[PDB]
Design a protein around this ligand. Structure first.
Ligand SMILES: Cc1cc2nc3c(=O)[nH]c(=O)nc-3n(C[C@H](O)[C@H](O)[C@H](O)COP(=O)(O)OP(=O)(O)OC[C@H]3O[C@@H](n4cnc5c(N)ncnc54)[C@H](O)[C@@H]3O)c2cc1C
Length: 356
């Protein structure tokens, strides 16, 4: 029996760490992995080439995005574009990228260039209560994302590189210096609580957005025809599992609709996330920018969903939905975003088992 207060004051979840760990690592994880490997989810439409709107070696190769798309896929994305063009949806620089050739991992991005980006994403914490207050909750979310990223580079580290062979795997020393309570004076365990906080918030969004995917009108459209329906089935099982986790949110949530207060806040969030997306256009490690764009777009969607209780409830049961919608890009980023957090939670079990 897990419990979140997102009142707006000292936002937090009381939820036994082992319950989250069992749910995520054994019930959710291998099936969620299957879903992210399917065509609908493994390609993400993304613009990696915008100039930095804010200012002006071999980690060049550690950071390079692999842009390969098979001919079939190239053709397949045109089908999808066509299909999304004529349905309920409102040469760019934006191209489909294959996430499976660009796993999130250690890229050697470090030093002031990474510090500066983190500093500016954190300084977006600016909510109306004409003057900014920093929400505790925004802080925790970014911090959980920061934590997840650092967990990934620790867990998928470049351990060894000869003229010849590279070996990736867990780097316990890296993980410990980043996340050990003693070596960090307690900050590491707190950042991992923040990672769990992010995970529960996204978990919550995914459960609250279930009515959207259960409509018969909804489709995971791709190049195949029966695969899409097996994909749809997989997603729904995942969502029903998620909905089954006993997570409870206090009534005082700042997501609950008090009219003027809540809509202003939904819109401050969307504004911060658009900014963060543009901050990503300043990131010179291109895989970091791919995963930075993706995960912030998924986190933004997750929050959208949460502020959208009223729209999702008064949702048509069998029509196409007009009051509320998620694009392809949005759906891909949502599930992939939670996938990264899911994987980070999993990696934490791996590190525990490696530390004995
Ligand atoms: C969007 C983005 C994506 C990235 N992707 C990757 C990647 O895929 N692979 C990779 O190797 N590197 C990636 N990086 C860089 C990486 O996250 C680190 O910045 C880098 O490894 C530097 O390590 P660090 O300890 O010096 O700094 P950081 O760990 O970044 O520290 C920056 C500052 O924030 C504090 N801090 C660190 N973590 C937290 C937290 N969870 N909550 C609150 N404060 C915190 C630190 O104490 C320090 O003060 C990415 C960076 C960004 C901005």
């Amino acid at each position: 029996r897990c419990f979140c207060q997102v009142s707006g004051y000292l936002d937090d979840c009381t939820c036994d760490v082992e319950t989250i760990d069992r749910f995520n690592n054994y019930r959710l994880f291998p099936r969620l992995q299957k879903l992210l490997e399917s065509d609908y989810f493994r390609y993400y439409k993304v613009n990696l080439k915008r100039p930095c709107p804010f200012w002006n070696e071999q980690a060049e190769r550690l950071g390079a995005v692999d842009e390969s798309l098979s001919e079939e896929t190239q053709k397949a994305v045109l089908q999808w574009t066509k299909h999304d063009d004529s349905s309920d949806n409102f040469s760019p620089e934006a191209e489909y990228v294959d996430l499976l050739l660009n796993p999130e991992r250690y890229t050697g991005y470090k030093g002031p260039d990474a510090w500066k980006i983190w500093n500016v994403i954190y300084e977006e914490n600016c909510f109306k209560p004409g003057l900014c207050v920093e929400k505790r909750a925004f802080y925790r979310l970014i911090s959980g994302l920061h934590a997840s990223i650092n967990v990934h580079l620790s867990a998928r580290y470049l351990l060894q590189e000869t003229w010849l062979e590279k070996k990736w795997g867990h780097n316990i020393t890296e993980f410990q210096q980043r996340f050990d309570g003693i070596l960090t004076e307690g900050e590491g365990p707190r950042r991992l609580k923040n990672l769990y906080f992010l995970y529960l918030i996204e978990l919550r969004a995914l459960s609250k957005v279930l009515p959207f995917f259960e409509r018969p009108d909804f489709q995971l459209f791709t190049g195949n025809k029966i695969q899409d329906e097996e994909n749809k089935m997989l997603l729904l099982e995942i969502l029903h599992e998620i909905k089954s986790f006993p997570l409870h949110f206090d009534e005082n949530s700042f997501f609950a609709g008090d009219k003027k207060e809540a809509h202003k806040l939904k819109e401050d969030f969307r504004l911060h996330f658009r900014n963060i997306s543009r901050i990503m256009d300043c990131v010179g490690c291109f895989k970091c920018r791919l995963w930075g764009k993706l995960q912030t777009q998924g986190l933004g969607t997750a929050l959208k969903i949460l502020f959208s209780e009223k729209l999702i409830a008064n949702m048509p049961e069998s029509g196409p939905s007009y009051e509320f919608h998620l694009t392809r890009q949005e759906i891909v980023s949502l599930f992939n975003a939670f996938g990264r957090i899911s994987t980070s939670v999993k990696e934490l079990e791996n590190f525990r088992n490696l530390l004995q």
